[PDB]
Amino acid sequence: KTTLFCASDAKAYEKEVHNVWATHACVPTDPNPQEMVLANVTENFNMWKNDMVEQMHEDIISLWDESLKPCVKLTGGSAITQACPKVSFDPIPLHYCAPAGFAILKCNNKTFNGTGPCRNVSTVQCTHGIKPVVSTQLLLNGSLAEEEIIIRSENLTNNAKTIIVHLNESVNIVCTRPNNIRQAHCNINESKWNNTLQKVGEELAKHFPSKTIKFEPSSGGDLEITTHSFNCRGEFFYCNTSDLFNGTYRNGTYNHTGRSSNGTITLQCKIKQIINMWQEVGRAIYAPPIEGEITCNSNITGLLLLRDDTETFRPGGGDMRDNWRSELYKYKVVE
Ligand SMILES: CNCc1ccc2c(c1)C[C@H](CNC(=N)N)[C@H]2NC(=O)C(=O)Nc1ccc(Cl)c(F)c1
Ligand SMILES: *[C@@H]1O[C@H](CO)[C@@H](O)[C@H](O)[C@H]1NC(C)=O
Ligand SMILES: *[C@@H]1O[C@H](CO)[C@@H](O)[C@H](O)[C@H]1NC(C)=O
Ligand SMILES: *[C@@H]1O[C@H](CO)[C@@H](O)[C@H](O)[C@H]1NC(C)=O
Ligand SMILES: *[C@@H]1O[C@H](CO)[C@@H](O)[C@H](O)[C@H]1NC(C)=O
Ligand SMILES: *[C@@H]1O[C@H](CO)[C@@H](O)[C@H](O)[C@H]1NC(C)=O
Ligand SMILES: *[C@@H]1O[C@H](CO)[C@@H](O)[C@H](O)[C@H]1NC(C)=O
Ligand SMILES: *[C@@H]1O[C@H](CO)[C@@H](O)[C@H](O)[C@H]1NC(C)=O
């Protein structure tokens, strides 16, 4: 309804690029935020039409434009060239704050699915701290659902609408390029993953009750969405997930169908230089990988799925607004 500002806890002395951007763009955080419960009120939220998502999107586009400059950007006919130094890159949390005369309403119901009426509501200055993590298929380093796995969608009957799964337990994923120059791998403990897809299948079954629930790899698209792609210490990883989204939930029981070894799923990854941009239709070209060992140890805290007698879910992504949405779902700006 108005333009928000960000608060962050960044230092002017990190050269980490999120810190630099935030010290230019954000104000410091309140050491004690105010919060005002109101359990009588009941208000309506819709995470799928939330202008906070559009402001955060614009901010993160700006952050990446100033921080992860490509050697070459191809958009349409033009090709822009610029210095593309290797940088230190590690996302920091950002708070979105209502300016004077406005408030942010926060839905306090643990099981709120992001849409409709919410009975227990608070008013706050700023959202919690949100790390702006760009990725497909898996949502990394978010905040977990407080109680049970929530399944969010603008419309579950529309198979074209992205499904956001909000986990209540995180699943570790460790991706490393060890000391090919391009070749890397991710390790996931097949047991944790096993359990969580068992519970995700339960929830999806509540919403599609006659049907068998199948997880399969992504069908088609650019590599950015047919693999789990993400940025790690400035390098763009593309990790094959066909051993991950590969399993059947039949009779209240989940069977995993992808290959593991020693109780570990290992995704084969590549570090790429030519990127299909998430910000706009275009390609961006980066320099070859820095040397040493490139490792990110992340929490999987959610999934992005697409639905195709049986219901079949494949990993999705590509619109980073769904990533922001997964964190901003409980917030509205009012007044
Ligand atoms: C489900 N269908 C909707 C859908 C599908 C795919 C995409 C969109 C929407 C928007 C976006 C358009 N851009 C383009 N065509 N060049 C395109 N997404 C991307 O290219 C994208 O995320 N790349 C990417 C790059 C780097 C990293 Cl680390 C990353 F995690 C992702
Ligand atoms: C979310 O909850 C609303 C009611 O609050 C319901 O109408 C809608 O179908 C639900 N959506 C999902 C994906 O559960
Ligand atoms: C998480 O939610 C699932 C399904 O919604 C539930 O079965 C499970 O007990 C919950 N686990 C924890 C640790 O809260
Ligand atoms: C969402 O699903 C279908 C679209 O295929 C349509 O009935 C309408 O757009 C929505 N229906 C419900 C029940 O929300
Ligand atoms: C992932 O790996 C499988 C087998 O290793 C292969 O068939 C598939 O095409 C790969 N997908 C991508 C996007 O590389
Ligand atoms: C599941 O993994 C196996 C190998 O681990 C592969 O042969 C199979 O194609 C995968 N399932 C699907 C549906 O792709
Ligand atoms: C879950 O993963 C563990 C580790 O490999 C395995 O022993 C267990 O049988 C799996 N459960 C399944 C596939 O349902
Ligand atoms: C997730 O957070 C950890 C701890 O801050 C960090 O090391 C890791 O690189 C993060 N993952 C991504 C993809 O940013």
Question: Quick one: tokens of 326?
Answer: 């997964």
Q: What is the atom index within ligand 2 of the atom nearest the CA of 152? A: 13
Q: Which residue out of 87, 138, 171, 296 has the highest number of ligand 8 atoms within 8 Å of its CB and is therefore the one to mutate?
A: 296
Distance CA 117, CA 97 (A): 23
Closest CA to 179 of 292, 83, 84: 292
Which has the closest alpha carbon to 292: 235, 207, 225? 235
Rounded CA separation 87/44 (Å)? 42
Q: From the CA of 163, which ligand is nearest?
A: 2
| Spatial CA neighbour of 321 closest among 299, 304, 296 | 304
Shortest-distance ligand to the CA of residue 155 = 4
* Residue 169 beta carbon below 6 angstroms from any ligand 3 atom: yes
CA of 150 to the centre of ligand 3 (A): 10
Do 46 and 115 meet the contact criterion of CB atoms below 8 Å apart? yes
Whether the CB-CB separation of 54 and 321 falls below 8 Å is answered with yes
Helix axes 51-67, 320-328, angle to 10 degrees: 130
Closest of 162, 204, 159 to residue 48, by C-alpha? 162
CA 186 – CA 176 distance, rounded (Å): 6
Q: Are β-strands 5-8 and 27-28 bridged in parallel, bridged antiparallel, or unpaired?
A: parallel
Ligand 4, pocket residues at CB < 6 Å: 155, 157-158
Residue 148 alpha carbon, nearest atom of ligand 3: 2
Q: Residue 192 is inside which H or E element, if any?
A: helix 190-207
Q: Is the CB of 14 under 6 A from ligand 3?
A: no
Q: Of the candidates 73, 99, 98, 129, which has an alpha carbon nearest to the alpha carbon of residue 282?
A: 73
Q: Are 243 and 147 in contact (CB under 8 A)?
A: no
Q: How far is the CA of 260 from the centre of ligand 5 (A)?
A: 15
Closest ligand 3 atom, residue 169 Cα:
13
Cβ(254)–Cβ(247) below 8 Å? yes
H/E segment holding residue 74:
strand 72-75
Q: CA-CA distance, 279 to 222, in Å (whole number)?
A: 15
Which residues sit with their C-beta closer than 6 Å to ligand 5? 223, 226-227, 240, 242
The rounded distance, in Å, linking the Cα atoms of 97 and 84 is: 32
Query: By what method was this entry solved?
Result: X-ray
**Residues near 13 by Cβ (< 8 Å), separated by ≥ 6?**
none
CATH classification number, 5-334, choose in 1.10.10.10, 1.10.240.10, 2.170.40.20, 3.40.50.740: 2.170.40.20
Q: Quote the ligand 8 centre to 45 CA distance (angstroms).
A: 30
Q: Give the three-class secondary structure for 35.
A: strand
CA separation for the pair 212, 198 (Å, rounded): 13
Its sign, for the CA torsion 220, 213, 264, 290, is positive
